[PDB]
Amino acid sequence: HHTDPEKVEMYIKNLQDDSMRVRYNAATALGKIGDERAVEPLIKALKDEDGYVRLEAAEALGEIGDERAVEPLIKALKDEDPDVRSEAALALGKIGDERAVEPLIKALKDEDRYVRMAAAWALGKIGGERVRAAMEKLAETGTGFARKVAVNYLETHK
Amino acid sequence: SKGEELFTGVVPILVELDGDVNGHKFSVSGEGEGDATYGKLTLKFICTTGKLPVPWPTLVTTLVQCFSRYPDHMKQHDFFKSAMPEGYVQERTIFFKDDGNYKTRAEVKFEGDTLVNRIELKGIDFKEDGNILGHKLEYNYNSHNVYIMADKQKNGIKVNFKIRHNIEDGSVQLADHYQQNTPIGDGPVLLPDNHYLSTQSALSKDPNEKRDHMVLLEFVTAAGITL
């Protein structure tokens, strides 16, 4: 598909603007736009001094769906801020990489509920056998929120 | 689906809300029209009870997802349309980061041939010098993704998302939305694989209207599945 290079430049630049609302908007923008040139800059936005900015940059990388950002996202799951680590989960379920199956299953056990909920979807999205596998094991090794999820997938998915 | 046939052109819309936030009673009502062919929603909502105790954005989400533009290949996943015209029930719980929380119950259905949303809101724990009760929020909205996932156990969907409300001279007040929808009638409905929706909303103000109001321009368009 086609990406307006004028805006692409602008927004990747704006990613290092003094104002945070600016660089927050640049994240959302570049996610929708979906250009490969924004992936690298967005992983470096993933370490942004501001949390809300880190946060978008995450889902932004999810939207763009490039397999490059899988690892940095997995590391971003461990972010201090929970909201950021939630959107990182969601992002990883979008990309659909199997490499996020474990770190997501680990997040089903996260302290914050939204982050537990995010992962749930994300895994549900990725699916297939390597998910179906870890789910069947979790119906026994798991407990509480996480356990409730495992059974629900094995209910729905084959 | 039989529901989707209804939304083929432009369909008029109506919304009514009764709310109570930390005691502050109020009610909102709105009128407009929606072309699911473009995912477009265009409406005007007004506080009937004079002044609104909260900032308009909070209520956006609670105050129709049947007008969502589902692509051709994903047409099997529009639970909302499928549930019509009998309609569906949208129950939410909205935790504001470092502030209070809402509980809502909406009844979204077709009346004659107008889409109608009837909501019943309950707010608690909201800080008085909070952003909500302190009206510290900008008059605009962001693009968000609404994460959808079927509920085999019940017979509908668990929806979840995290709204980002801009502060006037500040960052962002978050809002974890925990949603759940369920059908009104007993008809058969589509239950979808995990996908999401991509929203674009615009807030504006009519100069001629003197009441407490909001002018909304939405564009929900579904994404996720691939074929």
Residue numbers in the entry:
A (entry chain D): 9 to 166
B (entry chain A): 2 to 64, 68 to 231
Pull verbatim passages from the article behind this deposition.
A family of artificial proteins, named αRep, based on a natural family of helical repeat was previously designed. αRep members are efficiently expressed, folded and extremely stable proteins. A large αRep library was constructed creating proteins with a randomized interaction surface. From this library, we selected by phage display αRep binders with nanomolar dissociation constants against the GFP. The structures of two independent αRep binders in complex with the GFP target were solved by X-ray crystallography revealing two totally different binding modes.
bGFP-C–EGFP (complex 2) crystallized in the monoclinic C121 space group and crystals diffracted at 3.4 Å resolution. Complex 2 contains three hetero-dimers in the asymmetric unit. The refined structure consists of residues 2–231 for EGFP (chains A, B and C) and residues 9–166 for bGFP-C (chains D, E and F). The three hetero-dimers are structurally identical with a RMSD of 0.167 Å and 0.140 Å for superimposed Cα-positions. In complex 1 the helices of bGFP-A are oriented perpendicularly to the barrel axis of EGFP, whereas, for complex 2, the helices of bGFP-C are parallel with the barrel axis. Although the size of bGFP-C is two times smaller than for bGFP-A, its interaction surface with EGFP is larger by 375 Å2. The interaction surface between bGFP-C and EGFP is quite different from that of complex 1: bGFP-C has less repeats than bGFP-A and almost all of its diversified residues are involved in the interaction: 23 out of 24 randomized residues are located in the interface and 21 out of 24 randomized residues are involving in contacts with EGFP from chains D, E, F respectively. Unlike previously observed for the four other αRep structure complexes already solved, the not randomized C-cap module is also involved in the interaction. The favourable enthalpic contribution reflects the important involvement of hydrogen bonds in this interaction, as corroborated by the structure: the bGFP-C–EGFP complex involves 165, 154 and 156 contacts with 9, 9 and 8 direct H-bonds for A:D, B:E and C:F heterodimers respectively.
